[PDB]
Structure 1
Amino acid sequence: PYRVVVLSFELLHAPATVCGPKKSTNLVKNKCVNFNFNGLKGTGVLTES
């Protein structure tokens, strides 16, 4: 006998349920960098506010 599991996720994305943002990275300051803090696209320099 073998132990088998079925992973069945449906489609069409209207009940957006599980997802994953993941890949949380480090931070830099006083540098010309691209930032993606929450999915926002942009570039520039980061400092303390």
Structure 2
Amino acid sequence: FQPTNGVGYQPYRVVVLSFELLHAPATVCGPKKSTNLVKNKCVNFNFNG
């Protein structure tokens, strides 16, 4: 690599994030915050994905 080389021949740093979704419990969760549990009533739920 040289800094005078064209953009085809310039350094690029690559990070590939690969997520696996198995039957195991999910450990990597987003920054969404939990709410209180509401029972015996029809709700729209997101239970750990």
Please, what TM-score do these two structures have when normalized by structure 2? 0.36
Which of the two has higher C-alpha Rg?
2
Which structure is higher in helix share? 2
Which structure is higher in strand share? 2
